[PDB]
Subunit: 230 residues, 4 copies
Amino acid sequence: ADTIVAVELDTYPNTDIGDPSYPHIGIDIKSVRSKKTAKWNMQNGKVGTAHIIYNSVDKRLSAVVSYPNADSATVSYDVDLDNVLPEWVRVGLSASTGLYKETNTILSWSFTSKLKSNSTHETNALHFMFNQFSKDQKDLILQGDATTGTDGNLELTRVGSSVGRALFYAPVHIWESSAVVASFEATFTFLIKSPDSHPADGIAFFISNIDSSIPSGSTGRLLGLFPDAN
Amino acid sequence: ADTIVAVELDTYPNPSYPHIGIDIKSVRSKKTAKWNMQNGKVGTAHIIYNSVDKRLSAVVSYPNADSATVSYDVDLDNVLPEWVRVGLSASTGLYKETNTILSWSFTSKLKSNSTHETNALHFMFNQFSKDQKDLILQGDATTGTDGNLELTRVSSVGRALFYAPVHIWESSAVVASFEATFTFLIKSPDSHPADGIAFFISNIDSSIPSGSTGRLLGLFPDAN
Amino acid sequence: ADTIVAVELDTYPNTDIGDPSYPHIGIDIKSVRSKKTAKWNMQNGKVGTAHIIYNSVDKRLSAVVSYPNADSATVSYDVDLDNVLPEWVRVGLSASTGLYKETNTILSWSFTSKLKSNSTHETNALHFMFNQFSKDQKDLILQGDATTGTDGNLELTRVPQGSSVGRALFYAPVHIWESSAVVASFEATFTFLIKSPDSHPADGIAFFISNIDSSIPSGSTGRLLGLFPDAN
Amino acid sequence: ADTIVAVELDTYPNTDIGDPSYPHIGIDIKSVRSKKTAKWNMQNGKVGTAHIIYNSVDKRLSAVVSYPNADSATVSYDVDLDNVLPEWVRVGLSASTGLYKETNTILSWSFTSKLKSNSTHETNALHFMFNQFSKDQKDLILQGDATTGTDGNLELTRVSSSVGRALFYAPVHIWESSAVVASFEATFTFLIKSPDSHPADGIAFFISNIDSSIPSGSTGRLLGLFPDAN
Ligand SMILES: [Zn+2]
Ligand SMILES: [Zn+2]
Ligand SMILES: [Zn+2]
Ligand SMILES: [Zn+2]
């Protein structure tokens, strides 16, 4: 299967296994059973922002989700991604809807990754920023029900029970054995919108092997990321 | 064929001198300037363009020397497709010379007019690795030797294109602009090598055209 | 006096001598008499964006002003700033109101300046970005009626009657050019909201570059945009 | 006195008070008695690089110092800078020499600080980079023996017991009560050079109140930062 490191915004009622019986943000390392979680107060129809950061000096992957005029939920996890991920990966977003009609709208998305080498300054860097998606977004690989262009946004899920992913087209070198400091950072703004006020829903920024594709039956609480709940 | 906009560093013996030129769809530069190639020195090339001026400019300098600069008014929206790929290219004549790229960086932005809808792509390589998956190598081009990109084989032709398509312009941007810098080392035992390097912008599926050797820099099929 | 290079958004009625009789954006080099202009359709109460760019390879100073869902006014001028400006300067914004009540609100402001040297990559760079100003904005030098913090914005002009003049300059001197750079360039963007009850306000806003000790010149009210001491 | 948060490269034999008995890199919070240290192998005459990073999601201040073709000494410390530093500060470099002649040369210096607010994208940012200092470097406030321009470098200490500091001119807003994530990052390359092979010496990146100045008698081991060894 795909190796997948992800930061999920999960509102699924999956009081299923290690799953919080409440909406939470969690860090997932190769499994849908989050290695760490924190309670998140989803706000239906509000635009929230997620910031994920990681650097190899700390080896700590962190994420903060906030909504204007509210609190932020933050979650961290010590992990050395060099041991988990392959050197070259693809980064993307993903979402899955439950039995409900709700939309998983991405208003903006940016990412930056850098590899500073120890030989005085050999910095390599990749940075992309989308503040407006277009109908024919060729630097994105869309998977599932995901589409771009409607109002200049990226609709991950079809516009229930939908799954869609968007991955940036160029492979990203997230680490190399020679960097003295490798680090990345991503930010995206999203709008979860549902008529039922308790929608079971999921969005996640993720990092996977470059050929990753939606695994069979990874619907609902598996966020289009995992093939099973193991 | 491919649509190609390029900035060439041409020492091939036709102007009748080494020059840097701006090429729009043809190997016959729309504008040129004399360039003093320095065999074995590391030079830097900066290419910039913005849609407010519609001027594509380039400066090539060597440490402790002069710079050759060249500009050309052109509105790229009329020439290039909206989505392109950017890359470097080089071709050697009958000589053994190397076309070494030590570093390469690029930035492209599309500011929209709806208060700040800026889209951006930026990549920078100060060190290439043996398995450089974000580059598409063509011809004799190879990466990794000493952490460099060897465009030509050590009569060679090689090109390196960044993997992700780039959106160079969109009808709705109030200002679209890009900028590229790359450092290169042209080294040859004969002190007057016929040689060529070029940063270029082409259709995404561009490939080295048949017989685009020597002076056609791996870019053009004929001298038209 | 101060050396001033500015890009003005001028709706003042100086139908005085060669002066455009319409709202224009213009490039001013040391004088309120624009070296070049273009017509601009001010939109009262809308938020507009201005981008100013210059590089030493082209030696062309350009500006575009746009409002969402409209057209843009753009203006350029060939000039080598090395010949006009001192090597170290301060950059800032300025505005002046006429007899009208109107506000000159700056919603955001960013700047970037770089000096690439020719010695393989000796790039120096300064970049600042404000998307929210605060009540005590210490990195800004405020002059005149200008104030920060109301709703996280910069009010250039003051919000009995009469005119107003205010300027905000970034605190750190900026090195705009140095004899050794193979390419020097800067870029600024700011969003503004000009709002007035009269639908034809006489008003003026400008991004400008001056000597580090520049200060509002005496009597530089109204059409002189807080920048110039006289209409010469 | 000044509020000072600093990252030191200390080779002083100051087996003086809590002071390690070996060359170390340490994180100092208001006192010359490092809140945390790590052993550093100083290389006389080589060019080293120092990367300092901090973010308010982890609240961890970290530093790595490496020499080309060598190892790195890294050091971290959990601290929420909001509780220590004032909202507005100035950042700078500092060095002091012992009874020895040695030079503390800074070849390059870059800094970035950001305050992302929570109201969708209200990011404020300050970034400066020096790869070449000039004789009349007006955006720097030079203190003590520090001087710029010799070969395009910054000589913190007097090149002929020396103390010199260089601070960037503009105050920096390091934190504000409303940012969801505040973070900074600094990198600087230095060259310590001495004829004695065990020079007692000290360099430090630091953050202080905007009006900070070299405190009286802060020579030698007090790195031009502290008034006493408390
Ligand atoms: Zn979960
Ligand atoms: Zn030619
Ligand atoms: Zn005017
Ligand atoms: Zn110590």
